[PDB]
Design a protein around this ligand. Structure first.
Ligand SMILES: CCCC[C@H](N)P(=O)(O)O
Ligand SMILES: [Mn+2]
Ligand code: NA
Length: 261
């Protein structure tokens, strides 16, 4: 699907709101706070101030407003009032907002209190694998190349790439074509074109790539219980590159990546 300039403008707004949620929640990610409380703050902010709504709530039955994953949890962790954060924890908060009918999906890592050396390294490499993919996006490039580039980098830095979950198209629909794998697959063959909008959300494990899903049907963990990190951005392919729709002040990459001279 190719988004019109109208659709794209609406996605800038939605993406911006999703990013502002992460920028707002940051000071609250402290030792002692529960993930259930972090979820309420995000939701109250999304509904009461941004006047938008979470796309996560109700999606295939998802019970909360944002996904919060800690340490070995790979993704889709469910906020809970009894789960408290502690020093060393690495935490991902994934936000998806719907505004004016369009989605904005983004997530970032937060390290609680005193960081662990490997925890910091894992988050750093994960974010760079996303940045690397983002600087690649431009018409002509194949999604298979993007996934191969992410995997090559991640593996060269001593980590692994989760295969089961991937990025995805997005717009009026939460998940739309195409699938955005973060590794090289023979299944992938998609030449990017301007107007396409999708997400890139690499999940990187400190240990092995294998994962497992808990009985709740949502919580995904690393099979070997090693740490897992993830960063995600929503973008739109431009005539000569791409525009990040969910950029935050702490991002060290500009919103528009143009390959023009
Ligand atoms: C609550 C459903 C999870 C939706 C996540 N944003 P993704 O599908 O990008 O992991
Ligand atoms: Mn996503
Ligand atoms: Na994790």
């Amino acid at each position: 699907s190719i988004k019109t300039p109208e659709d794209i403008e609406k996605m800038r707004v939605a993406g911006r709101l999703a990013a502002e949620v992460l920028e707002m929640i940051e000071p609250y990610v402290k030792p002692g706070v529960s993930t259930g409380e972090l979820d309420r703050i995000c939701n109250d902010y999304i509904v009461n101030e941004q006047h938008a709504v979470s796309a996560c709530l109700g999606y295939h039955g998802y019970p909360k407003s944002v996904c919060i994953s800690i340490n070995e949890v790979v993704c889709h962790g469910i906020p809970d009032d009894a789960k408290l954060l502690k020093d060393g924890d690495i935490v991902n908060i994934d936000v998806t907002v719907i505004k004016d009918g369009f989605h904005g999906d983004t997530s970032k890592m937060f390290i609680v209190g005193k960081p662990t050396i490997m925890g910091e390294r894992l988050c750093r490499i994960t974010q760079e694998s996303l940045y690397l993919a983002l600087r690649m996006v431009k018409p002509g490039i194949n999604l298979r190349e993007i996934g191969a580039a992410i995997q090559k980098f991640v593996e060269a830095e001593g980590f692994s790439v989760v295969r089961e979950y991937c990025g995805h198209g997005i717009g009026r629909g939460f998940h739309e074509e195409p699938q955005v794998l973060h590794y090289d697959s023979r299944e992938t063959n998609v030449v990017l074109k301007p107007g396409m909008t999708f997400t890139i959300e690499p999940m990187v494990n400190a240990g092995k790539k294998e994962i497992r899903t808990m009985k709740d049907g949502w919580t995904v963990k690393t099979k070997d219980r090693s740490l897992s990190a993830q960063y995600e951005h929503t973008i739109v392919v431009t005539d000569n590159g791409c525009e990040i729709l969910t950029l935050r002040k702490d991002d060290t990459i500009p919103a528009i990546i143009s390959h023009d001279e």
